Amino acid sequence: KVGGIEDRQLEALKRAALKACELSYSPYSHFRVGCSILTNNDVIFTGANVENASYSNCICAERSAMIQVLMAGHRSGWKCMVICGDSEDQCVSPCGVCRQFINEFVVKDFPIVMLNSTGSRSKVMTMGELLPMAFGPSHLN
Amino acid sequence: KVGGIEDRQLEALKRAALKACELSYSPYSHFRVGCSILTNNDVIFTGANVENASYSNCICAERSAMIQVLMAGHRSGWKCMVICGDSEDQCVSPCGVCRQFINEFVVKDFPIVMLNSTGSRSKVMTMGELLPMAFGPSHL
Amino acid sequence: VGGIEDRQLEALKRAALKACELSYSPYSHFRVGCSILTNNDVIFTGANVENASYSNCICAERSAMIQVLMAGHRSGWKCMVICGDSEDQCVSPCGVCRQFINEFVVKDFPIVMLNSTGSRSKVMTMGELLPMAF
Amino acid sequence: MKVGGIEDRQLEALKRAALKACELSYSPYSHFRVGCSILTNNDVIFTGANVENASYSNCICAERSAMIQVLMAGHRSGWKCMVICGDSEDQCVSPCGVCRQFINEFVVKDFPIVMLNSTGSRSKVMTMGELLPMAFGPS
Ligand SMILES: [Zn+2]
Ligand SMILES: [Zn+2]
Ligand SMILES: [Zn+2]
Ligand SMILES: [Zn+2]
């Protein structure tokens, strides 16, 4: 149940993620996704997916949330991320594009909580687990 | 230039875009770009480019700025956008990816102001001029 | 089309129309086809490829360009035709594709856009479609 | 033996094709070249290289270039193996999250992905399932 995070904080994060879905702009898939991030200063940021007529332009909820955090000055030290989506049964897991984005700013043990639309199903995995052998700045020279 | 927008607001937009470059995360290209957007109720949002080891994952300043706007619940009626980048002489222009993103939320007369790195010069173009015969929902 | 022999343009339009059969689009069901004429007067074709993650979708224009580039033609393309799944409206390239094309062609590069059947056509240069390119 | 289900000759041929595919790379911004090779069910080999753009967001990795080739050739599934090799000598080139999500759309969980360094010195074999767990895929 996510180490390094108070029960109240985790409860708050999950509430923030479900509510973030309301900010979704998805007139093409109609599939809404919400995401919340807890900073090292215990501040909560939220994001939602934003689609576009040109499908390549879609921005996921996770990336929206991270953009918000980064623009607010929080370069690192994030404590947790919660992702919630309009999936009735299965939990919403971040897509590869988002995993690559998250990997750029968090430590290997960074916790990512994935929920289904109501939170009746949940899973917790670390950044390291979701993106093994991550491609990073080390591959450049 | 830039009708329907007071000069006071345009000026404030220009400085915000200039200063937005400081929020950039570009440890790879080292090229910084700042963007500011004025909403219909005259609130200013700013954004900067965010790079990634994987070039595919980079987010331009214009898109980071629009994300800020959208996540604040302003899904329509933006009044103007100013882009400023680390370009000595020439005015930084929005790439095609960002033009397509912007086109999704603004009218054709939407003004896009492009500044040089110092903000001593500018060039104004409308969304319609920057992305003619744009791919839109009507097509879908 | 300036500088394009009519037999090349006709062949291009035909290649674009049939290219949409290579499309993988189970999400939008919107099939798009694209063909490119090399300076070599060789025709290459592409179709859109979608993905569960919309961000990963590759348009037909880009699939066609990948094909041309992987064949070793990094310059001198003569024309491009795009055939969209829009019945009564010519399909125009999205901003992402315009930026991609701009990387390899001259400002006068012609881009022909057709509706789903090819009964309607519209031509525009690269420079007209992406003014003041980045 | 190195990779299950793949003959030693085939693989050898794949590694050579991937290394050679690097010369087709268009990378004037990062200068980092990447080559990729794919073995179809039909035993045919396709190759691809990375293609960059002034707008970094528009870059297409070698893995995606090779898959576009395969798909446009009519091979919608049943791929046997994928080989990836980059300019990085001191370590193998692993696919970025973008490519993993793309590959995941067309292959089975046990699909083998071979990663090599610039020369071929180092190598590592991992399956699609290991590279992208809890994948947000078609299934
Ligand atoms: Zn995602
Ligand atoms: Zn851009
Ligand atoms: Zn496109
Ligand atoms: Zn990649």
Side-chain angles (χ1 to χ4, degrees):
Chain A
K1 239 300 172 292
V2 212
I5 307 175
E6 310 167 359
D7 281 304
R8 48 177 166 174
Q9 294 185 301
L10 191 59
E11 284 189 58
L13 271 179
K14 299 197 180 187
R15 278 273 184 288
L18 303 170
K19 161 168 284 303
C21 284
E22 303 188 308
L23 281 281
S24 171
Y25 173 73
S26 47
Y28 306 95
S29 74
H30 308 304
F31 193 81
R32 315 172 306 158
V33 183
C35 171
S36 61
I37 299 175
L38 181 63
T39 63
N40 77 11
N41 193 178
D42 297 302
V43 176
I44 302 179
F45 284 81
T46 64
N49 58 321
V50 180
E51 310 192 322
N52 186 284
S54 174
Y55 289 17
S56 317
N57 266 84
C58 296
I59 302 301
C60 298
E62 301 95 297
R63 284 180 287 160
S64 294
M66 288 180 277
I67 287 302
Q68 294 247 96
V69 170
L70 294 168
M71 293 303 99
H74 306 277
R75 268 290 215 295
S76 60
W78 308 343
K79 289 168 163 52
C80 187
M81 168 179 271
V82 172
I83 308 177
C84 178
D86 279 346
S87 177
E88 211 65 289
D89 177 38
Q90 182 170 175
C91 299
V92 177
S93 61
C95 75
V97 177
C98 292
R99 297 184 196 196
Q100 186 67 53
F101 207 85
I102 302 174
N103 193 74
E104 182 80 29
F105 308 98
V106 309
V107 291
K108 255 58 241 190
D109 296 304
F110 181 70
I112 294 170
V113 184
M114 300 151 276
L115 313 174
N116 66 329
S117 67
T118 53
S120 57
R121 186 190 287 290
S122 65
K123 177 91 171 185
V124 189
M125 291 179 87
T126 64
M127 179 63 261
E129 299 175 58
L130 290 171
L131 196 71
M133 282 194 80
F135 165 96
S138 55
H139 298 274
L140 310 166
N141 55 127
Chain B
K1 77 235 329 218
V2 186
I5 299 176
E6 310 179 310
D7 292 309
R8 288 186 173 186
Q9 304 178 297
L10 172 56
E11 299 164 302
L13 267 181
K14 294 189 177 183
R15 186 176 186 291
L18 240 306
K19 303 303 177 175
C21 298
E22 309 170 10
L23 300 174
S24 168
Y25 175 72
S26 298
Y28 302 83
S29 72
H30 307 293
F31 191 84
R32 305 182 310 165
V33 185
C35 179
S36 64
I37 296 169
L38 177 66
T39 58
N40 204 270
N41 62 154
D42 307 322
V43 178
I44 298 177
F45 289 80
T46 57
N49 60 319
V50 179
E51 295 182 344
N52 185 287
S54 181
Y55 283 21
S56 301
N57 282 87
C58 298
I59 302 272
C60 295
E62 303 93 303
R63 280 179 286 159
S64 69
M66 287 180 282
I67 290 303
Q68 295 273 255
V69 174
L70 297 168
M71 294 305 98
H74 296 280
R75 297 183 287 285
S76 76
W78 307 344
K79 291 186 170 182
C80 181
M81 174 186 277
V82 178
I83 305 172
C84 186
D86 281 344
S87 291
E88 284 315 75
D89 320 318
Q90 48 179 44
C91 299
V92 175
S93 209
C95 77
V97 184
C98 291
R99 298 180 192 198
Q100 186 67 53
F101 203 91
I102 302 174
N103 191 61
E104 183 82 24
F105 308 95
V106 307
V107 299
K108 250 202 159 128
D109 288 57
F110 181 77
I112 300 293
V113 181
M114 302 156 268
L115 304 182
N116 60 339
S117 68
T118 59
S120 63
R121 304 187 311 179
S122 71
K123 297 179 180 185
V124 193
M125 289 270 265
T126 59
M127 179 75 282
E129 289 154 39
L130 293 166
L131 193 73
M133 206 180 126
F135 180 76
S138 64
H139 222 58
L140 301 172
Chain C
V1 180
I4 305 298
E5 304 188 308
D6 286 296
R7 63 187 57 182
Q8 299 186 305
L9 183 63
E10 304 301 14
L12 267 180
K13 296 184 179 180
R14 271 179 156 69
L17 288 167
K18 76 89 242 307
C20 68
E21 73 164 290
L22 307 174
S23 171
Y24 172 70
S25 51
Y27 305 85
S28 71
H29 292 298
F30 193 72
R31 305 192 312 169
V32 183
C34 176
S35 67
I36 297 174
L37 181 64
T38 62
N39 197 85
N40 196 191
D41 301 309
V42 173
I43 292 176
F44 286 81
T45 61
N48 60 317
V49 172
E50 311 196 312
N51 183 281
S53 176
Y54 289 15
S55 182
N56 267 78
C57 298
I58 295 179
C59 298
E61 298 89 306
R62 278 175 292 155
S63 288
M65 289 186 272
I66 289 305
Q67 294 258 290
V68 177
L69 292 168
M70 291 304 94
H73 303 272
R74 291 178 293 275
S75 74
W77 307 343
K78 297 187 173 181
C79 182
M80 169 185 284
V81 178
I82 308 171
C83 181
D85 227 0
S86 301
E87 292 179 48
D88 313 282
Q89 180 166 52
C90 294
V91 66
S92 55
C94 74
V96 183
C97 287
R98 298 186 190 193
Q99 186 61 51
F100 201 102
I101 303 168
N102 186 64
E103 182 79 33
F104 309 94
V105 308
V106 302
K107 56 189 174 178
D108 289 293
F109 180 75
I111 292 178
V112 180
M113 304 159 280
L114 314 173
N115 63 318
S116 71
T117 66
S119 65
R120 309 186 189 187
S121 62
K122 189 105 177 180
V123 187
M124 284 178 78
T125 60
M126 175 71 262
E128 287 169 60
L129 281 178
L130 197 70
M132 302 183 69
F134 157 61
Chain D
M1 309 183 100
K2 306 176 185 177
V3 174
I6 306 299
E7 295 182 59
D8 283 41
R9 271 188 175 182
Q10 286 170 307
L11 180 57
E12 212 187 347
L14 276 168
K15 302 189 177 184
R16 285 185 176 60
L19 274 54
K20 197 162 190 171
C22 283
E23 296 166 9
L24 294 175
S25 170
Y26 175 77
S27 47
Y29 306 102
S30 72
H31 306 305
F32 190 69
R33 307 176 307 165
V34 185
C36 173
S37 50
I38 298 182
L39 185 60
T40 64
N41 203 317
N42 192 196
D43 289 301
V44 181
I45 295 180
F46 289 80
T47 63
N50 61 319
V51 176
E52 306 191 328
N53 184 282
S55 173
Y56 294 173
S57 172
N58 266 9
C59 294
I60 293 183
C61 299
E63 298 92 304
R64 282 179 285 155
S65 287
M67 290 187 278
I68 286 302
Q69 293 270 78
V70 172
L71 292 165
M72 291 300 95
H75 308 294
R76 211 81 106 195
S77 61
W79 306 345
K80 290 183 172 191
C81 179
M82 178 173 93
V83 175
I84 306 172
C85 83
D87 280 347
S88 183
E89 320 187 310
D90 292 53
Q91 59 171 296
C92 303
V93 174
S94 64
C96 76
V98 185
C99 294
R100 302 187 187 195
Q101 185 64 51
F102 202 96
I103 311 165
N104 176 270
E105 181 80 31
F106 314 85
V107 296
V108 295
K109 286 287 187 176
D110 283 49
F111 182 70
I113 286 98
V114 184
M115 304 161 270
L116 311 175
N117 69 314
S118 58
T119 57
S121 165
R122 317 190 186 199
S123 71
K124 291 177 179 178
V125 186
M126 282 183 76
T127 63
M128 178 71 261
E130 307 168 307
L131 285 172
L132 198 65
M134 283 271 277
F136 177 72
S139 300

Coordinates of all heavy atoms in Angstrom, one line a residue, chain A residues 54, chain C residues 59 61-62 94 97, ligand 3:
Chain A
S54 N -5.8 15.0 -35.0 CA -4.6 14.2 -35.5 C -4.2 13.4 -34.3 O -3.7 13.9 -33.3 CB -3.5 15.2 -35.9 OG -2.3 14.4 -36.2
Chain C
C59 N 0.8 8.4 -39.3 CA -0.1 8.7 -40.5 C 0.5 8.1 -41.8 O 1.6 7.6 -41.8 CB -0.2 10.3 -40.7 SG -0.9 11.2 -39.3
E61 N 1.1 9.6 -44.6 CA 2.2 10.4 -45.2 C 3.6 10.0 -44.6 O 4.5 9.8 -45.4 CB 2.0 11.9 -44.9 CG 0.8 12.5 -45.5 CD -0.4 12.4 -44.6 OE1 -0.7 11.3 -44.1 OE2 -1.0 13.5 -44.3
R62 N 3.6 9.8 -43.3 CA 4.9 9.4 -42.7 C 5.3 8.0 -43.0 O 6.5 7.7 -43.0 CB 4.7 9.7 -41.1 CG 5.0 11.1 -40.8 CD 4.8 11.3 -39.3 NE 3.4 11.2 -38.9 CZ 3.0 10.9 -37.7 NH1 3.8 10.7 -36.7 NH2 1.7 10.8 -37.5
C94 N -2.0 16.5 -41.7 CA -2.0 17.2 -40.3 C -0.7 17.9 -40.1 O 0.2 17.8 -40.9 CB -2.2 16.1 -39.2 SG -0.8 15.1 -38.8
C97 N 2.5 15.8 -40.0 CA 3.0 15.4 -41.2 C 3.7 16.5 -42.0 O 4.7 16.3 -42.7 CB 1.9 14.7 -42.0 SG 1.5 13.1 -41.4
Ligands
ZN3 ZN -0.6 13.3 -40.3

